[PDB]
Amino acid sequence: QGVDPPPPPGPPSFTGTKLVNDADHPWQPLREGDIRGPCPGLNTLASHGYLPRDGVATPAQIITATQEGFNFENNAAIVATYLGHLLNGNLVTDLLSIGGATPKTGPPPPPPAHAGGLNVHGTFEGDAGMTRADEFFGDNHSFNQTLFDKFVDFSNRYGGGFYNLTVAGELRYSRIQDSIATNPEFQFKNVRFITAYGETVFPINLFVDGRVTTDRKLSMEDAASIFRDMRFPDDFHRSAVPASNEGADQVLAAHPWVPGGNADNQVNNYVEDPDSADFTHLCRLYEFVVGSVQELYPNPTGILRRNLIKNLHYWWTGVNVAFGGCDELFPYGQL
Ligand SMILES: *[C@@H]1O[C@H](CO)[C@@H](O[C@@H]2O[C@H](CO)[C@@H](O[C@@H]3O[C@H](CO[C@H]4O[C@H](CO[C@H]5O[C@H](CO)[C@@H](O)[C@H](O)[C@@H]5O)[C@@H](O)[C@H](O[C@H]5O[C@H](CO)[C@@H](O)[C@H](O)[C@@H]5O)[C@@H]4O)[C@@H](O)[C@H](O[C@H]4O[C@H](CO)[C@@H](O)[C@H](O)[C@@H]4O)[C@@H]3O)[C@H](O)[C@H]2NC(C)=O)[C@H](O)[C@H]1NC(C)=O
Ligand SMILES: *[C@@H]1O[C@H](CO)[C@@H](O[C@@H]2O[C@H](CO)[C@@H](O[C@@H]3O[C@H](CO[C@H]4O[C@H](CO)[C@@H](O)[C@H](O)[C@@H]4O)[C@@H](O)[C@H](O[C@H]4O[C@H](CO)[C@@H](O)[C@H](O)[C@@H]4O)[C@@H]3O)[C@H](O)[C@H]2NC(C)=O)[C@H](O)[C@H]1NC(C)=O
Ligand code: HEM
Ligand SMILES: COc1cccc(OC)c1O
Ligand SMILES: COc1cccc(OC)c1O
Ligand SMILES: COc1cccc(OC)c1O
Ligand SMILES: [Mg+2]
C-alpha cells in the first residue's frame, strides 16, 4: 500500500501581512515523541500548530505552513521541501520528519534510503550554520548558545545591536572561517554552498515583523524566541509580501567565497571544488541531487518508483523557475 502524492500547493490566495501568532496557533511545549530539528522556521511552525505538532508532515503541509506562517515564497517552498523530501523523507507514506528518525514516517524505505529526516548530514544539512554546530562536533540539530552569543556579538559589532544584511555578510564568512579552523571534515559545496547564503537572510526577510517596511532588522529577543524557543514573537505579523532569499547576493559579495572543503581530514586546509554548483552554475545542484537520489534508490519498482517519479517532477517544477531553466532528468522514465 501507500499514498498517491498530490502536486504542490500554489501561492496563497492572500499574500499580505496578517497576525500569525493567533489564538488558533498557540505555542505549546513538546510532548513525548514530538520531533524538532535544524530548521527554526519549521520548528516554530510545528510548535504553533501550523504543522503537525509532532514535527512529521507531508510536503504539501510543509509548503502551506511556510506560506501561511511566514509568507515563504511558493517556488522557494517547493525547491526546499521536495529537496528535503527526496533525500530525507518517506516517498511511499509521503511523510517527512523535520528532525531525526521516527516511526511516525512509517515503514522504512529500502536501504541505502533512510527517511531519516532533515537532521541527516552531508547532502542537504551541512556546516557553518548560525545557531547550530557542525555535525563533526556531535550535534547538528540543537540550538547552540555559544553560536547564538556570536550571532549577538556580530549584531552588536555590525548591526547596532540588531541582525541586518551587513551582519549577515560578516557572520556568514566568520562562520566559514570557524569551521575551516576547527572542523577537519568541513564541507561547503553543492547543496550546502547554495543554502548557506539564503539561510542568513531568512531572519531579515521572514523573522522581522511584516509591519516593518523600512530598515528591516531583527532584535536579539525575537531571534532568541525563534531560534531557541521555537516561538513567534508576541503579536507576530508575517512578511507583507512572499519572500525568501532576497539579499543573499549581497551576503556573498561582502566576502566572495568558492565552494570546497578541508581536504585530507585536516584543519586549515580548504581546497576549492571547481565541479560544485555555485550561484552562476545552479543547474549543477539539480543534477547533483538527482544523482544523490539515484544512489539512495538504485532500482525502485511499484509505488516507490511512481512516487519517486512524481516527487522528482514536482521538485523540477520549482527548480526550473528558481534556477532560470534546467533540463528535466528522468532517471526512472515516465509514469
Ligand atoms: C545595519 O545596521 C548598521 C548599524 O545601525 C547600519 O549602519 C549604518 O549605515 C549607514 C550607511 O551604510 C551609516 O551612515 C553613513 O555613514 C558613513 C560614515 O560616516 C563617517 O564619515 C563621514 C564623512 O567624513 C568626512 O568628514 C570628516 C570630518 O568630520 C573627515 O574626517 C573625513 O575624511 C570625511 O571627509 C562623517 O560624516 C560621519 O560623521 C557623521 O556622523 C556621525 C554619526 O555616525 C557623527 O558622530 C558625526 O559627528 C557626523 O555627523 C562619519 O564619521 C557616511 O560616509 C555616509 O554618508 C553618506 O550618506 C549620507 C546620508 O545618506 C549623506 O548625507 C552623505 O553625503 C554621504 O553620501 C552615511 O551617513 C551609519 O552611520 C551606520 N550606522 C552605524 C551605527 O554604524 C547598516 O547600514 C545596516 N545595514 C543595512 C543593510 O540596513
Ligand atoms: C556549540 O558550538 C561550538 C562551535 O562549533 C562548539 O565549540 C567548539 O568545539 C570544538 C570541539 O571541541 C572546538 O574545536 C577545537 O578548536 C581548536 C581551536 O580553538 C581555538 O581557535 C578557535 C578559532 O580558530 C577559537 O574559536 C577557539 O575559542 C580557540 O581559541 C582546534 O585547534 C582543535 O583542533 C583539534 O581537534 C581537531 C578535531 O580532531 C583536529 O582536526 C585538529 O588537528 C586538532 O587536534 C578543535 O577543532 C572549537 O574551538 C569550539 N569552538 C568554540 C569557540 O567554542 C561547542 O562545543 C558546541 N556545544 C555547545 C556549547 O553546546
Ligand atoms: C520550506 C521547507 C523548509 C525546509 C525543508 C528547510 C530545511 C532546512 C534545513 C535542513 C536547515 C538546516 C541547514 C543546514 O544545516 O545546512 C534549515 C536551516 C534554516 N532554515 Fe529552514 N527549511 C525550510 C523552510 C524555512 C523557512 C520558511 C524559514 C524561515 C521562515 C527557514 C529558516 C531557516 C533558517 C534561518 C535556518 C538556519 C538555522 C541556523 O543556521 O541557525 N526555513 N532549514
Ligand atoms: C535553494 O533555493 C534557491 C537557491 C537560489 C535561488 C533560489 O530562488 C531564487 C532558490 O530557491
Ligand atoms: C529556499 O532556500 C532554502 C530553504 C530552506 C533552507 C535553506 O537553507 C538552509 C535554504 O537556502
Ligand atoms: C504533471 O506531469 C508529470 C507528473 C509526474 C511525472 C512527470 O514526469 C516525470 C510529469 O511530467
Ligand atoms: Mg547545519
| Cβ proximity of 262 and 185 under 8 Å | yes
Asked if residue 39 belongs to a known ligand binding site, the reply is yes
Domains along the chain with CATH numbers: 40-145+207-242+282-322 (1.10.489.10)
How many angstroms separate the CA atoms of 232 and 15, rounded?
A: 19
Which burial class, exposed, middle or buried, applies to 146 when counting CB atoms under 10 A from its CB (0-12, 13-18, 19+)?
Answer: exposed
**CB contact set of 259 (below 8 Å; sequence gap of 6+):** 188, 189, 190, 193, 272, 273, 276, 277, 278
- Looking at this protein, which amino acid is placed at residue 92? V
The residue count for the chain:
335
Name which residue sits closest to atom 8 of ligand 5, judged by CA.
195
Name which residue sits closest to atom 28 of ligand 3, judged by CA.
41
For the Cβ of 174 lying below 6 angstroms from any atom of ligand 2, the answer is no
Looking up cell 514536482 gives: 314
* Solved with: X-ray
* C-alpha distances out from residue 124 to 117, 118, 229, 260, 293, Å: 10, 8, 23, 15, 12
**CB contact set of 163 (below 8 Å; sequence gap of 6+):** 151, 155, 203, 204, 217, 218, 220, 223
How many angstroms separate the CA atoms of 307 and 94, rounded?
A: 8
Asked if residue 126 belongs to a known ligand binding site, the reply is yes
- SS3 at position 272: strand
* Ligand 2 atom, smallest distance to 134 CA: 5
Residues with their C more than 2.5 Å from the N of the next written residue in the chain, i.e. before a break, are: none
Which residue out of 119, 140, 195, 200 has the highest number of ligand 5 atoms within 8 Å of its CB and is therefore the one to mutate? Answer: 195
Compute the distance from residue 32 Cα to the ligand 7 centre, in Å: 24
Q: Which ligand is nearest to the CA of 290?
A: 6
DSSP conformation class of 54: T
Asked if residue 192 belongs to a known ligand binding site, the reply is yes
Q: Which ligand is nearest to the CA of 279?
A: 4
For the Cβ of 137 lying below 6 angstroms from any atom of ligand 2, the answer is yes
* Ligand 3 atom, smallest distance to 38 CA: 12
Other beta carbons within 10 Å of 26: 12
For the Cβ of 42 lying below 6 angstroms from any atom of ligand 4, the answer is no
How many angstroms separate the CA atoms of 244 and 241, rounded?
A: 10
Looking up cell 564568512 gives: 173
Asked if residue 221 belongs to a known ligand binding site, the reply is no
Q: Is the dihedral of CA 27, 29, 133, 258 positive or negative?
A: negative
Name which residue sits closest to atom 4 of ligand 2, judged by CA.
133
Resolution (A): 1.9
* C-alpha distances out from residue 184 to 26, 41, 119, 255, 280, Å: 42, 29, 20, 22, 28
* C-alpha distances out from residue 302 to 76, 92, 93, 108, 332, Å: 30, 10, 13, 16, 11
For the Cβ of 128 lying below 6 angstroms from any atom of ligand 2, the answer is no
**CB contact set of 170 (below 8 Å; sequence gap of 6+):** 154, 157, 158, 254, 255
* C-alpha distances out from residue 81 to 14, 78, 141, 163, 313, Å: 21, 5, 18, 26, 13
* Ligand 1 atom, smallest distance to 166 CA: 80
How many angstroms separate the CA atoms of 239 and 12, rounded?
A: 13
For the Cβ of 149 lying below 6 angstroms from any atom of ligand 2, the answer is no
For the Cβ of 195 lying below 6 angstroms from any atom of ligand 5, the answer is yes
Asked if residue 220 belongs to a known ligand binding site, the reply is no
For the Cβ of 245 lying below 6 angstroms from any atom of ligand 4, the answer is yes
Asked if residue 326 belongs to a known ligand binding site, the reply is no
Please report how many Cα atoms fall inside a 13 Å half-sphere around the Cα of residue 226, on the Cβ side. 25
Looking up cell 552588536 gives: 156
